[PDB]
Symmetry: C3
Subunit: 113 residues, 3 copies
């Protein structure tokens, strides 16, 4: 599950963006794309280092596939995509990574445990 909150306006989010995220996250995490969920929230009231220049606050939740090297690799990918598609500088992006226990993720009337 990847969520991006940004002050970039909705009209600046290119068509195809959610599919591009889905695809690249599936490749990066090694997870099947059927399990990948993405959520983009434009037009937000936000600031980064006191400034309202384009920025993004993001989260990536996964059951495993979270760790030092893997998170570095995710950040390079995701900042790269935010720069190329939303014109957000990578140094105005935070991404919180969460390694979820399977018992703590609900789906399809039960959990993954």
């Amino acid at each position: 599950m990847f969520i991006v909150n940004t002050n970039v306006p909705r009209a600046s989010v290119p068509d195809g963006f959610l599919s591009e995220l889905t695809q690249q996250l599936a490749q990066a995490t090694g997870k099947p794309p059927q399990y990948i969920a993405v959520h983009v929230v434009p037009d937000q009231l936000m600031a980064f280092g006191g400034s309202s220049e384009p920025c993004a606050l993001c989260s990536l939740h996964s059951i495993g596939k979270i760790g030092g090297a893997q998170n570095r690799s995710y950040s390079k990918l995701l900042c790269g995509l935010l720069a190329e598609r939303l014109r957000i500088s990578p140094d105005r992006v935070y991404i919180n990574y969460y390694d979820m226990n399977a018992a703590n993720v609900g789906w399809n009337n039960s959990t993954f445990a």
Copy 2:
């Protein structure tokens, strides 16, 4: 605290939905309804498995009352409600469960510790 983000439109969220979630969560968690917070965010730009068919990304935070069996039960309850009231398929819902330490939840100028 229960949060639902969904691509279902605002008009499709029935009047009374926040009160129903409040009541059912109070019953499920055993907590008084005065402590239950609910937040529904419709009209979102999101996808699940690459698809923009109705879906939901949710979170349930609680000080205790989180665990393997309890979270299975919550997921049956909450996917049931999202299916009945918002017409979302349970297999397009993720719920992240968070067992919060009392010291890490702020309220009324202090924390719950």
Copy 3:
């Protein structure tokens, strides 16, 4: 990173609020304001304890600077601000505090590790 979700309408958020939050959080956390991110989301569909008087659901993520006494101090400051500026009663504010590992925070194409 501080996020506030509230039912208070956008027109009730005073000019300067994101700067005030940035400033006061820099002071409270001891971190330079260049590293502080803030995000205010008004006009939400939310209830707290069964009712829809002004309320807020918030999160504060930090690499360290999270703990029992510190979090009590943050709650005093942030509930104070939300009361003074948004007219939200402190007993209708929840703030979830997250102590993030540096390896689990992405920024500038890498992590903080």
